[PDB]
Design a protein around this ligand. Structure first.
Ligand SMILES: Nc1ncnc2c1ncn2[C@@H]1O[C@H](COP(=O)(O)OP(=O)(O)OP(=O)(O)O)[C@@H](O)[C@H]1O
Ligand SMILES: Nc1ncnc2c1ncn2[C@@H]1O[C@H](COP(=O)(O)OP(=O)(O)O)[C@@H](O)[C@H]1O
Ligand SMILES: Nc1ncnc2c1ncn2[C@@H]1O[C@H](COP(=O)(O)OP(=O)(O)O)[C@@H](O)[C@H]1O
Ligand code: VO4
Ligand SMILES: [Mg+2]
Lengths: 751, 1202
């Protein structure tokens, strides 16, 4: 396991451990093979069931009821349905933090099962009821088969020197494969410097690198030295030649060849087979982050200046961990996949070192409130980690973290690094003075890491964990005409989408109105795409009836339509990446029906009816144009200018629709993690909440700084937080912290 | 080898005297070559700036020791701002330095070349003395500005005298040094605990100096002093903001990070004789101001984003890293890097890097940057190929780690040799992530730099400061009006490929607004007085810049926005009377319609005037619009009108960029000899710069008519921005002369990155700009002139006959607008139809001329000619507007024409008009009379040349003869084997003086095929007043039958290279030979193409810019009865060798045809790629049966069926 997983991604560690556990299980003494249950575990989702899914006492959702009735097929779980409805604690167990730790006894067994039997039975129950914890249960299963602390060397930092001097023969090259955003050349430069081993490093390319690398290898194999070839994935042919050359060298011992590469599928297979694979990847969990950060920084470098230096690094490390593990939650956490790398930590350490040397010229025991906090809270918000930040919401997130950590009130005794980490427990600041105390504090960190450690809400990983579990099961299972269909699909779609929508009449008074200009533009674009999509599907229908011939365009359209790819021709308004044709078509039908309603409203009235209609911002081609048009309408309706105008948003759940002359209704907005009992927000644990009929008002700017309780929430078009429409100012309820709002990734989504 | 040495030995005179022993030793090659290389290397070592110089010019410089006037061309590239050297009267003692803007810097101690004859010696001395003189003058200016720095109510006279006395960069340093010392002193005084603030005194001093400067810039100033006041105002506004922030945040200590983070200056004049008097420090960095003269550079507004950029870039300069700003386009990355470089007085060399920058090129560049201690800003570093991005990471790391030994001579490893690395050098790379044509950096290289995100520059501050410096009294209100206007234009107006509302557009608007204010002031003075309407000036400039690119639907939107941001302000466009009358005249000499206002030709003159305005403002242009919109005519008319108005001769060079490989467009450098050979664009620019023929006094317009993709345009990114410089991988730098304009005549910008769109002024030519009747007027006006004298008389009366039909709502307009509703095998464009129609009407006039020649007595009178022309009009309308569609659409168009027109028409009630020709007697004659029942010989059946006449054969052959008589290129599009080659060759066999040559176009065909064909069949390359390519066989016209013309593959950006080459050499009548770059003009060359429908597999639709010049004729499969006749003829011919099968000649054919039909509907190309069934199979069938039956004498019908 250790040698294989040292060259595998952390995601596939659990699958490989489960396979090893299976091998160990089959070689035991007399316990059952348990194939009848592993079959259902692997491929039990394929059981076909028409109308047997029925939740009991409404304690289960549809997916849970389907899973339980599929699991009832096994002989042991034949009584799940009666048992779940006869117990009250099951509701508590379903909504528990870590149900895999304690699973209720629901299966019926004639004999007391071995601990492995209970482990696999609880595995099946977890897969049926709480698949989010399935992966977290799978680890427990391995713990009962191969013994706990089996999957534990992986959490520890990699030991290059031992493996290179021991477990690697000279001939086999050391392949160092880095994920997007990582590099391993620095590790080997450090290793070679530490071993006092001379290393010749060459970058591959440009047809001089080849000659230089061959000469270097030739001289090194007969003398005993280290050679690095960096980024050797841009010359696969020369890499085949190198793989052929290594097999017949018989080099001097202590010689080593290191091949740095990116993980790309064009690496030669024979080279991968003839080498030793080391995968370099972002650490799993804050604990591993801290451990490897500390292992990277020499102990001589820590505690050279006054002892407070040791604490700085610790905070720094902790800080780094957070901004490395909010990346795994990219929509909710860092809205963009930034490359917060090890160079960031090295530069942060260098600045801390230089400015703490300058602030205290050798004298020890510097005051906690005299350390240059300003020189670090800003060089690391505006020059080191803010260098990569693009928008201002991520920048305000970074500034929130920095202002909450790198403060004087962090040398206290009750300082809380994180809060509500277990729903009530707070990660306490360790009271150390020397590096080793902080390293031990790190190593005693509980293995119950939750996104609440990161500042994110606890349900920020449910979808991710379920997907991980499904991927694990799929990997295990894997390792163990179209014309009629398209005709039916296209005919159903053409029935689904409405017919062409009517344009808007151009009158002498309507042409000037900005609302009318925007609505006309929208209806015209909608009619254009409606004609195109309908005739394209009609063409596909006729092709699939055999009546119409095959065109190069029709070929491309059908080829990408049977596969479920949204055609490039249909994509003219912004849609989230990876949108399927079915979702796209339902969305298109929604947008066209909204535009039809707009057209009828405009026909009924020209000026009094284009402003009293509620427009769905999500189902709109260019909502920015709608915002500008509403602003322009309010500017023209009075003497006010465009610049001297600002937006105020009031949520009206009552749907009374007492719209003011300067107020426009908007429907379909979604808060991501907060509720509006009034016009005031409030943090909540629900993923999203619908806001019925938010009123947008344009009022003249007063250039007055907003209150403390007011937060600036971005509004994005869709869940892919990659496009700003506008920003709203919401006052928060009493006993709320705007910093908590910033960290928990609260936003508003149009779609 | 021998030739290079022979050439370089003759470049100078004294070089032969130098090393006289080897003169006969050469005239052993390796040792001589290496000795010369080592001489050049040690000479470059003596004067490191020689590394910026190539050998071809270094040899001249060393040789031209006596003639110093020759050296005054190499100084522009050896220095940053230095342009010339001010010598003595006898040109023996250099006295000073002259910038290119005219700002002398006189040495305190002149260098006498008499006692330092060697070029390197006195060049080093002049460099050192430039540094020393700048240092001493800066010290004196610092003392002077310290005299009135510590005072209030400065008199403008002394302040202006000080400004005029000293250089611009020295003035800016003086002011910043004084302010830094003042703030240091104030914070020190209040550093002894919280007390009263002498910081308010510094703020007040800054405010009063700023008030003095603003009033001084309100009145007219000399331009140089205007720029000096520009710099000072920007700087002191920055200082005012900084001091105001310090007062607001209540900083008590000189060590607080609110003050350390600010960039501070420390002048210590008592330092003992070195350039280290001035030390510039930011948070913890410490740079010694390098004393490089920079002339007069344009200072930037120091916005908070620029401050963040300074912070990050100085932090990266510490720790010997490099700075790597990134972001969207036009956010000031390059200019901020240059601003920092010139702020520290560094020699900054900007490079525009493309994929041609390789390991050796970057290595030589780094050798230069290291030896000289000059900064390097490599714009678009991600446009290198990722292999080279990885390869040069080794060199960058070698430099950085070798450079860190200074913080500990120092030399490094570059190109297998040791070079001296100076601490002053830096490496900067500016990138556009996520843009097309960009590579992805290795993670090995991303750790050698410090990235910085520059996404949203502070545009409001830039606008406010720029307007305030320009003299706008309401600068704040103007900025608050204008920046929200741009952010609302970016949202309300529709996103177009040519639309740009970024920072570059706003900067252009501000510069134009300043110019308009100055012009309005001058106009008022011709007729203090600072009650100008400033908002009107803003609307003036905006409408002069943002409107030309507006699409029809976004014009009302922008003007509503202008009316809502600037309420009550009115815009009144100028009249431009002199240019308008010149344009009207020029349009008269070129048979073009002129108009004013709503008249016919109005929108076109507005377009050409807007084009003139944008030409005034910008130096990179793009005329964007659908083909057939008058772009080319607009710019040609403007060039002629400007030539005759201003009196400057206007010369234009038209280049197709995509018709050649960019190795030929920009040039290359062979890896072995390391010798640079020019491309096409570079050769033109070098000829302009080296104005041997006085090219610098003319209006040079380099026009790029072709396709724009981020592969060759980006090589001119450094040319279309404020740099105005072209960078070559050779390291040569070519400055764009002020009289040169670069324009791109394009039809769309779908495949162009925003980086190039922002750098150019967009003028949008709608298709409504050039109206239909405008083209009709041009056609008729060219008809009544331009003899194709009795010929002219026929043309004139024919045009008189055609007049009532070519009406704005006449026959041709209604016919064309109806034909747009038909289905054509190719996309139907107006100009293609009109061109075919005009060529056939010219052929009608030629037919009348031929008839009148054939009757020396009784020529055709007005009545006969009237009938003939007015019937040929209907004939040609039908053929042009439906010659590319199937029979049903041709019949439908004929029916509509019959329904609308009143021309006499054939009376047959059930047959289409397309079956009817017009005889020379002006009568409708059926085509059926021209197709006889031919009797083929009993031999030579299905022979290659045997064509059985058919309706569709005579009609198509007549049409092709019509088109080929006027030598007009054309294309035959239809299903394979339908008879395109047969019909074309039948047409050509009637024309006796044309020789045809076949060309077969595959997916991998390049213009090299055409060039080889010309090299073989047109081997003459004559040189009369130009160069002409002519067929070898005199008196004959060469036809190039290009089959499968729509086959060659499109690249990633929708361009077929050979199609662009053909379009260029047809429309412009020639091409460029990439051996001398001379324009070669075609003589007696014409083209005909044959293709399958674009819907077919492997077939691409052709470009409309190509389709304008070639009408398309649709040759379809012969129908059932057509095949029956065609092959019954062949059967009756062949079933004659055996005179007993005669009665079987009719069923056999039917049987043949019957089977054919079945197969053609059974095995389509849907099943397999080769299941194409064509009349070629019937021809092979008849020919095969004939070959079988030829030797036999008797044969039973059973054997025949066998
Ligand atoms: N003012 C005008 N009056 C009449 N005809 C004009 C006028 N300007 C241009 N034309 C005609 O319009 C046609 C197309 O315009 P032009 O040749 O200027 O190029 P274009 O369509 O703008 O661009 P390109 O040649 O690059 O596709 C030509 O036949 C030209 O003679
Ligand atoms: N802060 C600023 N003050 C003044 N001018 C600016 C500023 N930022 C950008 N500009 C101008 O805008 C243009 C941007 O050019 P460039 O520096 O090439 O930006 P980019 O590299 O992002 O394309 C330059 O002409 C520059 O003079
Ligand atoms: N009316 C006709 N008279 C004689 N031959 C014909 C006729 N119609 C079709 N064909 C045959 O059809 C074939 C078309 O071949 P060709 O014109 O050379 O290629 P393509 O049609 O692809 O340009 C010729 O071989 C010719 O013999
Ligand atoms: O952002 V650019 O320097 O490619 O215009
Ligand atoms: Mg730039």
């Amino acid at each position: 396991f250790n040698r294989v997983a040292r060259g595998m991604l952390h995601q596939d560690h659990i699958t490989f451990a489960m396979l090893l556990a299976r091998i160990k299980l089959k070689g035991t003494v007399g316990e059952p093979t348990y194939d009848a249950e592993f079959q259902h575990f692997l491929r039990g989702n394929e059981i076909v069931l028409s109308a047997g899914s029925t939740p009991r006492i409404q304690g289960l959702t549809v997916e849970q009821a389907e899973a339980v009735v599929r699991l009832s097929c096994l002989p042991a779980f034949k009584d799940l349905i009666a048992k779940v409805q006869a117990d009250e604690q099951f509701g508590i167990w379903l909504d528990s933090s870590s149900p895999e730790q304690t699973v209720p006894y629901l299966w019926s067994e004639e004999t007391p099962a071995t601990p492995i039997g209970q482990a696999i039975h609880r595995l099946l129950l977890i897969q049926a009821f709480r698949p989010d914890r399935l992966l977290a249960m799978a680890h427990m299963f391995v713990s009962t088969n191969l013994g706990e602390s089996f999957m534990s060397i992986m959490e520890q930092p990699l030991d290059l020197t031992h493996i290179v001097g021991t477990e690697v023969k000279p001939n086999t090259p050391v392949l160092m494969c880095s994920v997007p955003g990582y590099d391993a050349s620095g590790h080997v430069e450090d290793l070679a410097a530490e071993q006092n081993t001379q290393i010749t490093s060459i970058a591959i390319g440009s047809a001089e690198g080849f000659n230089q690398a061959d000469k270097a290898i030739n001289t090194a194999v007969k003398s005993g030295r280290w050679v690095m070839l960096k980024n050797v994935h841009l010359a696969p042919g020369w890499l085949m030649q190198l793989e052929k050359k290594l097999h017949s060298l018989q080099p001097h011992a202590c010689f080593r060849l290191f091949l740095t590469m990116e993980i790309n599928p064009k690496v030669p297979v024979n080279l991968l087979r003839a080498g030793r694979i080391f995968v370099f990847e972002p650490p799993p969990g804050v604990k591993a982050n801290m451990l490897r950060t500390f292992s990277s920084i020499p102990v001589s470098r820590i505690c050279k200046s006054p002892n407070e230096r040791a604490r700085l690094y610790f905070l720094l490390a902790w800080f780094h961990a957070i901004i490395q593990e909010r990346l795994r939650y990219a929509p909710l956490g860092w809205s963009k996949k930034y490359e917060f790398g090890e160079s960031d930590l090295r530069s942060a350490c260098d600045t801390v070192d230089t400015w703490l040397d300058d602030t205290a010229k050798g004298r020890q025991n510097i005051s906690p409130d005299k350390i240059p906090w300003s020189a670090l809270k800003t060089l690391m918000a505006q020059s080191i980690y803010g260098g990569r930040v693009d928008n201002e919401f991520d920048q305000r997130l970074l500034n929130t973290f920095l202002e909450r950590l790198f403060t004087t009130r962090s040398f206290d005794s009750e300082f809380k690094l994180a809060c509500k980490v277990d729903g009530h427990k707070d990660i306490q600041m360790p009271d150390g003075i020397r590096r080793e105390e902080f390293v031990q504090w790190v190593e005693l960190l509980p293995d119950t890491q939750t996104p609440s450690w990161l500042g994110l809400p606890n349900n920020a990983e449910r979808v991710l964990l379920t997907t991980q579990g499904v991927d694990m099961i799929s990997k295990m299972l894997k390792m163990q005409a179209w014309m009629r269909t398209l005709h039916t699909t296209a005919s159903n779609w053409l029935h689904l989408i409405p017919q062409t929508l009517s344009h808007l009449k151009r009158t002498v008074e309507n042409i000037k109105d900005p609302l009318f200009r925007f609505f006309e533009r929208e209806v015209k674009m909608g009619a254009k795409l409606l004609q195109d999509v309908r005739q394209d599907l009609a063409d596909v229908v006729q092709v699939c009836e055999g009546k119409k011939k095959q065109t190069n365009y029709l070929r491309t359209l059908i080829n990408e339509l049977v596969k479920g790819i949204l055609p490039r021709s249909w994509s003219h308004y912004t849609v989230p990446a990876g949108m399927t044709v079915i979702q796209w078509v339902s969305d298109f039908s929604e947008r066209i029906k909204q535009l039809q309603n707009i057209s009828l409203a405009a026909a009924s009235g020209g000026a009094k009816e284009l402003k009293n209609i509620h427009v769905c911002l999500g189902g709109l081609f260019v909502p920015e144009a709608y915002i500008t048009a509403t602003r322009q309408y309010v500017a023209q309706a009075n003497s006010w200018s465009l610049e001297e105008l600002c937006l105020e948003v009031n949520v009206t759940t009552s749907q009374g629709a007492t719209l003011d002359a300067c107020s426009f209704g908007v429907t379909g907005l979604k808060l991501q993690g907060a509720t509006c009992n009034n016009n005031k927000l409030s943090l909540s644990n629900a993923i999203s909440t619908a806001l019925p009929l938010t009123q947008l008002r344009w009022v003249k700017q007063t250039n007055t700084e907003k209150k403390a309780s007011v937060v600036t929430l971005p509004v994005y078009l869709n869940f892919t937080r990659a496009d700003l429409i506008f920003t709203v100012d919401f006052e928060i309820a009493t006993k709320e912290d705007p910093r908590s709002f910033y960290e928990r990734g609260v936003a508003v989504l149009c779609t | 080898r021998w030739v290079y040495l022979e050439g370089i030995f003759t470049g100078s005179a004294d070089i032969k005297h130098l090393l006289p022993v080897e003169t006969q030793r050469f005239q052993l090659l390796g040792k001589i070559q290496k000795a010369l290389g080592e001489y050049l290397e040690r000479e470059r070592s003596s004067f490191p700036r020689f590394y910026f110089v190539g050998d071809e010019d270094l040899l001249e410089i060393i040789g031209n020791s006596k003639n110093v006037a020759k050296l005054q061309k190499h100084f522009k590239k050896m220095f940053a701002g230095v342009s010339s050297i001010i010598l003595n009267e006898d040109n023996s003692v250099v006295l000073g330095i002259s910038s290119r803007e005219g700002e002398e810097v006189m040495f305190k101690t002149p260098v006498s070349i008499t006692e330092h004859p060697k070029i390197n010696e006195w060049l080093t001395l002049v460099e050192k003395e430039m540094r020393v003189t700048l240092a001493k003058l800066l010290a004196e200016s610092v003392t002077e500005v310290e005299i009135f720095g510590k005072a209030t109510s400065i008199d403008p006279n002394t302040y202006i005298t000080w400004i005029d006395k000293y250089q611009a960069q020295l003035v800016v340093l003086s002011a910043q040094i004084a302010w830094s010392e003042n703030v240091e002193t104030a914070l020190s005084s209040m550093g002894g605990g919280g007390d009263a603030a002498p910081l308010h005194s510094v703020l007040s001093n800054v405010e009063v100096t700023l008030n003095v400067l603003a009033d001084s810039v309100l009145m007219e100033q000399p331009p140089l002093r205007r720029r000096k006041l520009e710099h000072l105002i920007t700087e002191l506004v920055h200082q005012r903001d900084v001091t105001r922030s310090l007062i607001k945040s209540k900083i008590d200590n000189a060590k607080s990070f609110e003050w350390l983070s600010q960039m501070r200056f420390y002048f210590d004049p008592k330092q003992t004789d070195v350039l280290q008097q001035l030390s510039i420090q930011m948070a913890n960095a410490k740079f010694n101001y390098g004393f490089e003269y920079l002339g007069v550079q344009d200072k930037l507004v120091q916005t908070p984003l620029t401050d963040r950029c300074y912070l990050t870039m100085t932090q990266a300069l510490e720790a010997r890293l490099g700075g790597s700003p990134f972001g969207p386009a036009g956010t000031g990355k390059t200019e901020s890097v240059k601003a920092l470089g010139h702020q520290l007085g560094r020699f900054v060399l900007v490079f525009n890097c493309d994929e041609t920058f390789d390991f050796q090129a970057m290595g030589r560049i780094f050798v230069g940057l290291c030896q000289v201690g000059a900064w390097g800003c490599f714009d678009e570093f991600n446009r290198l190929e990722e292999r080279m991005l990885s390869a040069v990471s080794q060199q960058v790391q070698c430099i950085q780690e070798a450079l860190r030994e200074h913080s500990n001579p120092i030399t490094c490893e570059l190109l297998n040799k040791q070079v001296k690395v100076s601490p002053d050098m830096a490496i900067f790379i500016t990138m556009n992530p996520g843009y097309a044509g960009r590579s992805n950096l290795p993670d090995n290289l991303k750790k050698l730099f410090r990235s910085l995100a520059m996404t949203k520059p502070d545009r409001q501050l830039i606008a406010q400061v720029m307007l305030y410096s320009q003299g706008f009294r309401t600068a704040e209100v103007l900025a608050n009006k204008i920046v929200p206007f741009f952010k609302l234009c970016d949202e309300q107006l529709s996103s177009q490929s040519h639309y740009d509302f970024g920072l570059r557009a706003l900067k252009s608007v501000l510069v134009s607004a300043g110019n308009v204010k100055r012009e309005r002031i001058q106009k008022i003075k011709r007729e203090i007085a600072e009650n100008l309407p400033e908002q009107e000036i803003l609307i003036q400039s905006v409408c002069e810049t943002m409107v030309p690119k507006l699409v029809a639907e976004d014009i009302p939107l922008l003007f509503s926005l202008l009316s809502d941001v600037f309420p009550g302000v009115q815009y009144h466009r100028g009249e431009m009377t002199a240019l308008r009358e010149e344009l009207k005249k020029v349009c008269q000499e070129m048979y073009l319609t002129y108009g004013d206002g709503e008249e016919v030709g109005g929108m076109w003159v507005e377009k050409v005037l807007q084009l003139y305005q944008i030409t005034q403002i910008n130096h990179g242009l793009m005329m964007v619009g659908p083909s057939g919109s008058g772009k080319s005519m607009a710019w040609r008319v403007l060039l002629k009108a400007l030539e005759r108005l201003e009196g400057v001769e206007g010369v234009a060079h038209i280049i197709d960029p995509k018709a050649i490989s960019k190795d030929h467009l920009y040039g290359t450098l062979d890896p072995n000899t390391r010798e640079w050979t020019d491309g096409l664009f570079t050769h033109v620019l070098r000829k302009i710069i080296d104005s041997v023929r006085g090219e610098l006094q003319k209006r040079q317009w380099i026009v790029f008519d072709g396709d724009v993709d981020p592969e060759w345009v980006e090589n001119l990114n450094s040319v279309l921005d404020d740099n105005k410089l072209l960078t070559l991988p050779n390291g040569e730098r070519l400055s764009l002369p002020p009289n040169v304009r670069i324009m791109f005549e394009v039809q769309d910008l779908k495949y162009a990155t925003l980086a190039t769109v922002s750098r150019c002024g967009m003028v949008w030519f709608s298709e409504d700009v050039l109206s239909t009747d405008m083209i009709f007027n041009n056609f008729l006006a060219r008809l009544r002139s331009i003899p194709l004298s009795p010929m002219l008389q026929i043309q004139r009366d024919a045009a008189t006959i055609m007049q009532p039909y070519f009406t704005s709502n006449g026959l041709v307009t209604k016919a064309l607008e109806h034909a747009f509703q038909l289905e054509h095998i190719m996309d139907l464009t107006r100009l293609r139809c009109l061109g075919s129609l005009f060529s056939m009407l010219h052929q009608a006039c030629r037919n009348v001329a031929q008839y009148n020649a054939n009757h020396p007595d009784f020529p055709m009178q007005i009545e006969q000619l009237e009938r003939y022309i007015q019937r040929y009009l209907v004939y040609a309308i039908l053929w042009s507007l439906s010659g590319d569609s199937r029979l049903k659409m041709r019949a439908e168009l004929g029916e509509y024409i019959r329904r609308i027109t009143t021309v006499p028409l054939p009376t047959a009630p059930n047959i289409p008009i397309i079956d009817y020709e017009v005889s020379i007697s002006g009568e409708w004659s059926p085509w059926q009379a021209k197709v006889p029942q031919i009797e083929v010989e009993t031999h030579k059946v299905a022979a290659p040349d045997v064509v059985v006449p058919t309706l569709d054969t005579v009609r198509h052959e007549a049409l092709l003869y019509t088109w080929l008589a006027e030598h007009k290129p054309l294309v035959l599009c239809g299903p394979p084997g339908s008879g395109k080659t047969m019909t074309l060759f039948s047409a050509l066999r009637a024309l006796p003086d044309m020789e045809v040559v076949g060309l077969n176009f595959s997916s991998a065909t390049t213009p090299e095929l055409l060039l080889k064909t010309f090299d073989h069949y047109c081997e003459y390359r004559r040189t009369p007043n130009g160069v002409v390519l002519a067929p070898v066989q005199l008196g004959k016209w060469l036809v190039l039958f290009c089959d499968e013309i729509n086959l060659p593959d499109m690249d990633k950006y929708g361009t077929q290279r050979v199609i662009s080459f053909i379009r260029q050499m047809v429309e412009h009548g020639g091409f460029y030979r990439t051996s001398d770059q001379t324009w070669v003009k075609l003589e007696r060359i014409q083209f005909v193409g044959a293709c399958n429908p674009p819907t077919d597999p492997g077939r691409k639709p052709l470009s409309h810019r190509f389709l304008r010049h070639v009408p398309v004729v649709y040759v379809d499969y012969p129908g059932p009865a057509s095949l029956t006749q065609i092959y019954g003829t062949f059967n009756r011919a062949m079933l004659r060798l055996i005179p007993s099968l005669r009665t079987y000649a009719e069923p056999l054919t039917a049987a043949m045809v019957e089977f054919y039909t079945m197969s053609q509907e059974r095995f389509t190309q849907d099943t397999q790629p080769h299941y194409i069934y064509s009349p070629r199979e019937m021809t092979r069938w008849v020919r095969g049966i004939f070959e079988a039956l030829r030797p036999l004498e008797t044969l039973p019908v059973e054997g025949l069926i066998r």
